[PDB]
Every structure is written in structure tokens, then in C-alpha cells.
Amino acid sequence: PAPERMHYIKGYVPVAYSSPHSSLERSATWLGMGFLLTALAGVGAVLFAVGANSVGQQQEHWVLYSIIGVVFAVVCTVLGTVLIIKGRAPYNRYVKETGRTQ
Amino acid sequence: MKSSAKLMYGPTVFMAAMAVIYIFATMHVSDGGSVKGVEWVGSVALVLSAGLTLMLGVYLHFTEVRVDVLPEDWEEAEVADKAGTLGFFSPSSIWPAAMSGAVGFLAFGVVYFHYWMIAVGLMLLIFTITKLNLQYGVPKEKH
Amino acid sequence: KHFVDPAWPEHNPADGHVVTELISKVAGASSPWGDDKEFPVSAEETGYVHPYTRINR
Amino acid sequence: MGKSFALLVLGAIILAGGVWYTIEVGYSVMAIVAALIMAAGGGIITWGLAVAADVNSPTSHKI
Amino acid sequence: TAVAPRVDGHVAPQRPEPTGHARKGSKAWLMMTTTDHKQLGIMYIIMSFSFFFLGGLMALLIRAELFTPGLQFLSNEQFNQLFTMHGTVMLLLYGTPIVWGFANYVLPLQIGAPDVAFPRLNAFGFWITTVGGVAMLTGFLTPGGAADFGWTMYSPLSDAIHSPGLGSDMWIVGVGATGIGSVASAINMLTTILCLRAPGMTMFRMPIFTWNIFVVSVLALLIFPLLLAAALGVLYDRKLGGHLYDPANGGSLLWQHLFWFFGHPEVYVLALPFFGIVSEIIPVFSRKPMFGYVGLIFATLSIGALSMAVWAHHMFVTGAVLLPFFSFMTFLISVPTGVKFFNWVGTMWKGHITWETPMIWSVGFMATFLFGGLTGIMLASPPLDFHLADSYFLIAHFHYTLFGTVVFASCAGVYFWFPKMTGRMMDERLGKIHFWLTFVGFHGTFLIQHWVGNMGMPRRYADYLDSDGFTIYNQISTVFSFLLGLSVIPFIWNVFKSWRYGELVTVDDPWGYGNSLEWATSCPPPRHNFASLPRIRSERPAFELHYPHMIERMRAEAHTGHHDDINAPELGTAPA
Amino acid sequence: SHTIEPEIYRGVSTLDEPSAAWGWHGLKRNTIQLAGWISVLFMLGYNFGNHKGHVETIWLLVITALLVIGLLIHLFEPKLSQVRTITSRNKPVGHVEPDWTYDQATLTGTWGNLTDSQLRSVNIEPSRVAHLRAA
Amino acid sequence: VTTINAIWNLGPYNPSQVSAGSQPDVYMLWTDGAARVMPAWELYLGNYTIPAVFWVAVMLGILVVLLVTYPFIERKFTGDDAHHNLLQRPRDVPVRTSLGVMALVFYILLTVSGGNDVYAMQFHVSLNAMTWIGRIGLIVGPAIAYFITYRLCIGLQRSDREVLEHGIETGIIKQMPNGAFIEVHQPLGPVDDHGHPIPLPYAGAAVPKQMNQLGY
């Protein structure tokens, strides 16, 4: 397999998205992206519940809709976030190990 | 092909989430502008769509795990790393147009529902696909 | 011993197979003419005999 | 400018003329004919304006 | 980074010949038999513009008959046939094939491949699309005529019991064949991106047109099988006496759900590639990079995900879909579609804009499409769509929006890549005449339709009463419709004339600041695209190739943050 | 490298039609005119018939108009002059293009005379190249 | 395995009866089609008259006479009266190929118009449209056919010269170190010092176009 880092002289700065340490290939990141997109549906759910309540309907279930909305939103947000961070770990240690960010 | 294989898990997770959400919602929620009950078209459609993206993501990942570090998947590749053979490509072929004509005859037979047209169109289609797939292998004439 | 086709490439046995369903040693399609071949060849060894045709004028 | 203004003059005479005719015809089939005259009038109006819009800042030289 | 030797006896490779110098017999048998992706692309584009003229002629007949209250020359049946076939031709024989034609031409030039993955499958896609067109239009040759149930083919109106003519069958097989063409094209493009990129052309160095073609290939592969399945179910029902779409089987809404699960992703399949063409054009004439490149990729893939969950906002007034779910989903997919405008403004922000024809067409696209999308979010809200569904307001929405993408940005692509395609430029003045005619005619046609739709006119109405109050609006709209129809006369003349007598291109990049890789090769490219390849390091390699003194500057200015890693130490050691 | 020069055979150039020697190539222009105008006359003669509808007549007269304008532009042979303009960053004819890929690979030509900072920005340590260009 | 003339289903002959699709056999359909496409051009000369179906017989006779006299008008217009024993490939003689094809289109349109009512019944075209397709198409169809055929002839011709100049396209695409993609050709004859073939002359015969034809 190819080495961990490649030859950069001083003064050279790359465009380095597909590098081996970039979170755009580490699989955790894209799952976290999926879950972060998915979390917004729970915000939609709680808003639908509260809006239906405010005009006097959905009265037998709007508290349950609010509960499932907020818990779905928060668990998707949380596990998607931590998955993003687990994808972005190698780049962070790269940024520590050398002065290079780009 | 790492990023390509991995970015198929965004839509997979999303479409699976929307499938389960849509299913539970259409069976349990009630509003005055629809009748309660699980909506089967959108259910099957979303789960099979997540199946398609799952299929591509999993096959491409299972391939990626045993392909070498290619120059086109490398940030500082030299242009001379892909020097050599790239592969075989068809230079010319009359049989694509032939196949379109076979499918046209079949489709017009289906339109009018003439049985002989359907038979002849299916015969033409198997013939033209076969001749397409035998193009670069036909023997030299032995006389 | 098991059979191998005479047109089949020889290979390093540690390197698996010439081709398998997931992977190949080429980026496009393998050629019908055997990838072990190197083209072009001499016209003498293609066997094409170019005719000499004269028609009455 | 040149032909710009020329077009803008001609097209107006066409457009007004069609507007005079679409009131005379008035819902028959020839109303369509009137509209076509009006459209051609508007086309030549815009044609003149387009010429102006090109010679305001040409992107090509006659070389 | 290695450096070559200044080799002896070196002279640049020979330039291919431009168009218009052809001897007789040079393209007949080649057309019939070629597997060259770029001749196939030219054929796609010519074919789709011919169908554009057909469908638009149908539309202008519609506008002529709506000019005054009575039925002046059309019947009710013929008016129904006309709007049905106008819709079908413009969406499935102009739109999708021009998408795949532009893809076929420029995509292997953008990623650095010689061919596409499956050349004969590419040829098959072209020919099956042409046969689908011929089949679909053959219905007009019957005595009864074409299909007349709207391009949506709603059931039970599409059952044999309610639409028995043969044209109703021909329409089905037509759309089926066109879908077969699309899936062939989609397979090709996807494999070609996965398997034939150039050295150093990693995924996050491809241009944005390539990324959009990626995601729309995925969408097309999802949806076109489903339309073929549903429509072969309809043809099964009609021919064999089946009952799947029977009304007592819930068949009406079975059809509507299936159709729109195909059909909204299809409008995104038509929108995204032309957003990509505009994202190619805007940075070239601003002399500025494309702003927010990775963010644009994420927005594109976000649309690709969301498009499969927003489908049933075409069914709000059916009283049979869960309203808040699809309303919220539509409100979400509005967000990444709108982020594209912010990125284009960032690409123009304090640039050095020059107004050649493609920049004019692209900014006209932006102005046109903004209003269409603003109109769209009103339909996303069911309280408003209760009044607006199947009104002329909807006509105005999707015409603003489908002209914004598939017409304005299609002409932008034509002007932008005509030099590369042919080796010749087009006449800039005739292009500006085309643009202003199209612009004036278009806004004069479809802006006033918002009002007449809000006022109570439904779509698909052959005839109306002079008491409705609709007459004056229809009259204004039809006058500007004929103007918009005249707009194609300078366009056809410009293409024809410039193809054989146009100004010759002497440079690899006649606009000067070409970002993508297609401007690193000649005009026109050789048979296998590249006589030599440059170093790919940015996402705009051609710019780095032609202006090396800028390669230090852009890397310093790329980010707003105070990144200091141009003073970082050496990394690695030696090998490469 | 080598190319054979063309030859004419009964008025047909081998550059235009390769096998001009082997058979009958190109029937001439006056026969095209004769055939087309006889066919126009027949297309006009069909209007004299016992038929009652004029859909037929519109078809006949449109196809006659197409035939006539076709034969007219065949007779008079229109041509236009090549456009003599310069648009955008296109250069006049006769300008010679450099091979930028070779110039980049070798650090010569258009990539000649790069500052040391510009050489570092492309990952060329200037020590290597100063020995070999601009020494 | 297939009927051809169920005479029992037709019944004996009666001058008063007739059927819808009462066509003749296929080799005669062209004559019937001629009878259908000819307009009602009849001459009334005092006490006499020349029926419209006279011009049918004139037209058919002309076609027949033209067919029997083709070698002689080809001698007039090619200027060749030599003694031949080697055939021509049809691509190498485009005028004759295009004339023959447009005559085949003429004959096929007369045949299809001779059975046009069966066409209309089975594909649901207007029968009036079918006779008008016969009339207008016996002009425009042969012209279109001549043009299409001529250009395809020259294209096949030119495709042969491509391979006698540069050799067979192998389909193998090979990348050079400078980045160039080059397709490997296989020369059919000797080669120049720079690898470019020495172009062979066209010999009237078939030139192979793929490696499998050489036997690889």
C-alpha cells in the first residue's frame, strides 16, 4: 500500500480533498451526513404536532408526535455528529502532526 | 474508488429513514385530507430505492477493498503512471442501429398486437443482440 | 492436473488469477486478441494477400 | 446605431398596424393573422434593440 | 515533481480540421456505424433540437387557438392531442436526450478519458431514443390521432375502456423506448466516471458538471425502470384485459403514486445537469474560481437524496396523501436547490465579468429560474395549492422553471462548447438577437399567465367564455408566444452559417480562462480526445496550464481564514 | 508522409469520390434539373383530379414549394464568405499554438521564466531547476 | 405448415359479388398499385374516348421497356463498351446502385399501394392518405432513396480507403508517457520509416476491417 504522507517541499500548498487522511473517504463521514439530513425530519414532526395543536386538532396524539419528533431529531443529530467526528479524526491528528491544513 | 463507494451511504441511510417514517406515519397519523392506512406504493418504492443505493454502495466497497492505489485515485500522480494499455474499445458497429430497429418492430407489433409482429420482433432482437455480442469473434473464412 | 486453455496468459501464482469478477489488470475491457499479444505485426504475418486487379479499358 | 433606429421605426409601423387590425377582425380566424403581424412587429422592435445592445459593447471586431 | 528533458526535434502535434471542410460521403456511413462518443453527442443534440421545434410548433398552435373565445380552427379532441404531445415531446424527446448528448460530448473530455466505457451501448441509446420519438409521433398519422390524456396519463382515463385509439398505445411504447435509451446512457456515464479517469483526476478534482451527471445517472437508473414497469402494466391492462389499474382496485391513485415517484425525479434529472453547465460557464467569464466547490457537491448529492421523498406534492388536491410530510419534504429540497444561487453570486462577487453570449444566457437563466422557483414554494404549501393546482399558475411555474434550465442553459451550453465541438465560433451579434427575442417573448408569454391562473382559468382548456374575463390575458400571451417562436430563426441561421463559414479558432481556449480539462486540448479534439495530458492538481487544470504565474496567487487567496501553511516545513523526503 | 495525388474520371475527382475509376460516378447537373422539374410538373398535375378535399392540396403545394426552392438553390448554387472577425480571446489566423503540456513537463516555453516562489508553488524545489534553466 | 389459397373459402365466381381485400398475387401487386395511383385523367374526343387506365398501360410499358434496355443506356452514358469478366462491388458504382435502389423503392411503393386497403385495415391508416402516399411518394421517395444511397455508397468507399491508408483499427487504446491516447493500427502492407504505412492501392476487392478477419 501507498505511504501515509507524500513529498511536500516548503512553499508548496496543495488542493488535497482526496488525500488519504481526508474525511471525505473514511465512510463514517458519509453515514453522519445521512443521519444529519435525517434528523431534520424530527424537527418537521414536532412542528407539525405543535402547529396542529395550536388550531385545536390532533388532540389525542400531538404530545406523542412531539415526543417522537424530538427524540428522533436528537438521536439522529447526535449519532450523526459523533460519526462526523469519527470521520474527521485522522485529519485532525494530521493537522497536529504537521503545520499543514490545506 | 473510495469516495464514490462511500458517498452511496448518504442516500441509503436517508431513504431507509424516509421509508420507515412514511410507513408508520401513513398507517397511524390521521388528517382530514386523507384516509388512514399504510400506503404501499411509496413504501415498496422507497425501500427498493434504498436497496438500489445499498446494492451499488456495497458492491463498489467490496471491490474498493482489494484494488491497488491507482494513479487516478492519488493526489500527486504523474501523467506517465497510466502509460501502457488502457483497454479494448469497439471502433465501429452496425448492430446498435440494428437492435433499435428490432425493438421498433417489436414495439409496433405490441401496439397493434399483431402476433406475427411480436414473434418477428423478438426473433430480430435475439438475433441482433447475438450478432452484437459475436462481432469481434466471427471466424476467418476457411476457403 | 487440471486444464488451462492454450490462449491463457501465464502468471505469478501468488498474484491470484488473470481476471476475476471483482477485478482485472486493465482499466477497460480485455481485448479479444489476447492482452499478451503486442501489436502491430508485419504485414507478412497477417496473411493478407493484397490483390492485383486490372480491368479492361 | 444606424439600422437599430431604422428597425425600431419600421417595427412600430408594423406593430401599430396589427393593433389596428386585431380590433377590426375581431374574433374570427383572421384575428390570428393580426396577432402574427403584431408579433413580427415586436420581433423587429426587439431586433433593433438587440442591435443597440450589441454595439453598446461589441464582443467581436471586424478583423 | 519530476521534470522532463528538453527533447530534440519536438514540434507540437497536428491540429484536427474544423467543420465545413467535409467531402461527400464523409459522415453517412460514419453516422450509421460510429461509436465515437462525441459524434454521438452531436447527433443527440441535433436530434433533440429538431424535436424542440416539433413540440414548440404544437405549443404555438395551442396559443393560436387560445387567442379568442370560440374554437376557430381546432376541435376539442385536436387541442387535447396537441397539449399531450407538446408535453411529451418537450420533456422526453428534447430534455432527456439533450442532457445525455451534452454528457456524451463533454464528460470524457472533462475526466480525461479517450472513449466512454461501453461505446456500442452508447450507440444503442441514441438509436433507441430516435425510434421512441418516431413511435410516439406515429400516432398523429392515424385517423383518430395521437394520445390525448395529458403527458401524465392519468387512470382510468388511460384505460382502454376510456381511451381506445391506437395512439394511446403508441405513446406508451414511445416513452418506454426513450427510457431504455436513458438507462443505457446512464450506465455508460456512471461506469465512465468510475473506471476511466486520468492520472491525478481524483473525485474531488472533477468539474461540477461531472458530479451532476453522476447523481442524475443514479436517479435515472432508479426511476426509468419504474416508468417502464408502470406503463407496461398499463399496456398489459389494455391489451390482455387486466384489472390492476381498475378504479375499484384503487388503480387511479396507484397510477398517480407510481407516476410521480418516477416523474418528480425526472424534473430534477433535467434541472441538475444544466445547473452544472452554468457552474462551468459562470467562473470562466468572471475570471474567478467556482465558489464553494465542495459545498456545491454536497448540495447536489442532497438534492439527489431528497428527490425520492418529495414526490407526492403533485397529489395534494387528491385528498389521499399525508399533507404535512410531503409539504415539509418539499420545503427542505427547496434549500439545497437555492444554495446554488448563492454559490453563483459568490462566483460573480467582485469579478472581472465579460459579456460574451454564454454569460448573457447564463445570467438570463438565473433571472428566469429564480421566479419559477419562488413560484414553486407556493405550490409546496397545500393551503395555496388547493387553489393553484391544475391552474394556469402551474403552467407559468413550470414553464419559467423548465425554460430557465432546459432552454436558457441549453443555449448557454451550445454557445459555450460550439468552438470545442466544431473548431469555429458563432456570430456574437446574432446570438444577442436570439437572446433578446427569447427573453422578451418568454416573459411576455408566461408572466401574465400567473394572473389569469389565479383569476380562475384551469389548464388544458380548449375553449372559454367571453364572460370569464380571460380574453385579454390570453391575447397578450399569444402575441408574445409568436414572438418567442420567431426567436429560433436567428438561432437556426447562426448554427447553420457558423458551422461552415464561422470564424476559425486558433487557440485551445477561445474564451481565455477555461477551467475544466476540455480546454487543455484542441478545437475540435482528436478522435481519442487528448494528444497529451497536463498535471491535474486543482479542479481547474486548464487554468493552471495557461497561467502558471497565477498558481501561487490563487492558492494564497483560496480561503478566507488566515491559513499560514505556505510557511510549513517540508514533508516526505524524495520518491514520487 | 506520403500521399498520392488525385485524378479526374469523366468529370469526377477522386478526392471527392474515391472509386471514380471503377464505375459510373456522379450523374450530372442538368439531369438533376430535368428530373426535378418533370417531378414538379407531376406534383402540379395531381391537383387536376376528381378529389374534393384540400388537405391534399396543401400537402401538394407545400411539397411543390420545397421542391422548387430546392431546385432553385441547386441551379443558382449559393455560397457565403468565411467570417473575418475575432471574438473573445481568439487570435488571428496563422498564429501558432504552443504545446502547453510539453512546456509544463519541461519548464520551458510558456513555463519558462518562473520565479522561485512560483517554482515552489508547483512543488519544484528551485535548486533542481536552476542548474538546468536560467543558469 | 401454411395455407396459400383456400379457394373453398372464396366460393365460385359471380360477376355481381366482390370482397374487400381482393388483391392479386404479390408479383402482380405492382400493376394493381399502378391502377390505384393513376388519377382520373380521361380523354373525351367527340364520339370516342381514351380511358384513364390507358396511362397505366403506358407507364407499365415504359418501366418494362426501360428494364430491358438498361445495358444500352448505360453504354451510352458511361462511355464504356469494353469486354468485362470481373464484377464490380456495388459500393464502387454509386450511380447504378442508387438508380437500382430508387427503382426498388418505386416498385415497393407500387406493391404496397396495390395492397393499401389491407395496410389501412391492419395498421389503421386512412385509405385516402394511402393512395396519396402512393401518388406523392412515387416522386419524393425515389429521390430521397437516390440521395441516401449515393452518400452511403461513397461512405463505404471512403471507409475502405481509410483502412488501406492506415490499417485495421485494432480497438486497443494505449496511453503514451506524454499523456496521448493512441489507437493501435495494424498495417496491411509495408511501413514507412516513421511507422506510417505505405498506402496500398484499392484493388476492387474487399478490405478486412477487424482483427478477427485476419484470424487473431
Ligand code: HAS
Ligand atoms: C426543471 C424542472 C422543475 C424544477 C427544478 C422545479 C422546482 C420546484 N418545483 Fe416544480 N412544482 C412544485 C414545487 C417545486 C418546488 C418547491 C421547486 C423547488 O426546487 C424550488 C426551489 C428553487 C428556488 C429557485 C427557490 C428560491 C431560491 C432562493 C435562492 C431563495 C432562498 C429560498 C428560500 C428562502 C425558500 C423560498 C421562500 C420564499 C418565502 C420565497 C410543486 C408542489 O410543491 C408542484 C406540483 C403543484 C401542482 O401539482 O399543481 C410542481 C409542479 C411542477 C411540474 C408539473 C407538471 C405537471 O403537469 O404536473 C413541473 C414540470 C415542474 C418542474 C420543475 N419544478 N414542477
Ligand code: HAS
Ligand atoms: C422543457 C419543457 C417545455 C418547453 C420548452 C415548453 C415550451 C412551450 N410551452 Fe409548454 N405549454 C404551453 C406553452 C408553451 C409555449 C408557448 C412554449 C414555447 O417555448 C413554444 C415556442 C418554441 C418553439 C421552439 C417554436 C418554434 C417555431 C416554429 C417552428 C415556427 C417559427 C416560424 C414562424 C413563427 C413563422 C415566421 C413568421 C414571420 C413573420 C417571419 C402551454 C400554454 O401556453 C401549455 C398549457 C396548455 C394547456 O392548455 O394546459 C403547455 C403545456 C406544457 C406541459 C404540460 C402538458 C400537458 O398538460 O399535457 C409541459 C410538460 C410543457 C413543457 C414544455 N413546454 N408544456
Ligand SMILES: [Ca+2]
Ligand atoms: Ca379560439
Ligand SMILES: [Cu+2]
Ligand atoms: Cu414535484
